From a paper:
YTHDF proteins bind the N6-methyladenosine (m6A)-modified mRNAs, influencing their processing, stability, and translation.
YTH co-crystal structures were determined in complexes with compounds 7, 9, and 10. Compound 9 establishes the disulfide bridge with Cys412, but the thiophenyl group is oriented in the opposite direction with respect to the ebselen selenophenol. Instead, the morpholine ring assumes an opposite orientation, being directed toward the m6A site and occupying the position of Trp470 in the RNA-bound structure; it establishes van der Waals interactions with Tyr397 and Thr414. Interestingly, compound 10 interacts similarly to its reduced form compound 9. Interestingly, analogues 7 and 9 occupy the same specific small pocket of ebselen but the different substituents affect the binding poses of both the selenophenyl/thiophenyl headgroups and the tail moieties. In the YTH crystallographic structures presented here, either in complex with ebselen or its analogs, an aromatic ring occupies the small pocket defined by Asp401, Arg404, Ser405, Ile410, and Trp411, which then configures as the major hotspot. Binding poses of ebselen, compounds 7 and 9 diverge in the remaining regions and provide interesting growing vectors either toward the m6A pocket or residues lining it, as valuable determinants for increasing target specificity.
Author numbering: 363 to 458, 471 to 558
The structure:
């Protein structure tokens, strides 16, 4: 049983492409720390993201500075998960509490133990796996991360729980409408 939303997305997008250029000629790369799986699922299916107010202004500034002279890539992980879950390219400036277009490219779980050896000089030389939201990754270390994420032979991804997230969204909307209706 495969869900038609996911079937539609997989046919319209080339997720986890075999020929991905990790040795970037230019670009900027940022960590995104999400609060929940549900937000990741929502972002993949609608091609949008919202950071915090401060996070939005940092990504807005970076995208407009890049002026399409190179990509802005976002490396996604939810707080506490122990893996990265995909990478998207930022595709629009922030629109105002503030959302922007993203294009998901990799959707796959990469355990933190494959990336912990990469450390970020611009964040007290901490592992890239102990970053906060919108932490920027230096270009050479971004190449190392993207090469590992691109080539890692993943065993699972959020897509394996896709129908679960669909039902969760649908139930949440009905619970809210009933609750709003009882307040009137
Ligand atoms: S608005 C959006 C778009 C795509 C995926 C998730 C979301 C979302 O609703 N996020 C809610 C929590 N955010 C945390 C950071 O501050 C903004 C809201």
């Amino acid at each position: 049983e495969s869900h038609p939303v996911l079937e539609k997305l997989k046919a319209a997008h080339s997720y986890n492409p075999k020929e991905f250029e990790w040795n970037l000629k230019s670009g900027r790369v940022f960590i995104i720390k999400s609060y929940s799986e549900d937000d990741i699922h929502r972002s993949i299916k609608y091609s949008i993201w919202c950071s915090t107010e401060h996070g939005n202004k940092r990504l807005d500034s970076a995208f407009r500075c890049m002026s399409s002279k190179g990509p802005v890539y976002l490396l996604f992980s939810v707080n506490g998960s122990g893996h990265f879950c995909g990478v998207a390219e930022m595709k629009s400036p922030v629109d105002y509490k503030g959302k922007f277009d993203v294009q998901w490219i990799f959707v796959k779980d990469v355990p933190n133990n494959q990336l912990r050896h990469i450390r970020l000089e611009n964040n007290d030389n901490k592992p890239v796996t102990n970053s906060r939201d919108t932490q920027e990754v230096p270009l050479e270390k971004a190449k190392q991360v993207l090469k590992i994420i691109s080539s890692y032979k993943h065993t699972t991804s959020i897509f394996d729980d896709f129908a679960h997230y669909e039902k969760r969204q649908a139930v949440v909307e009905v619970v809210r409408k009933e609750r709003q209706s009882r307040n009137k």
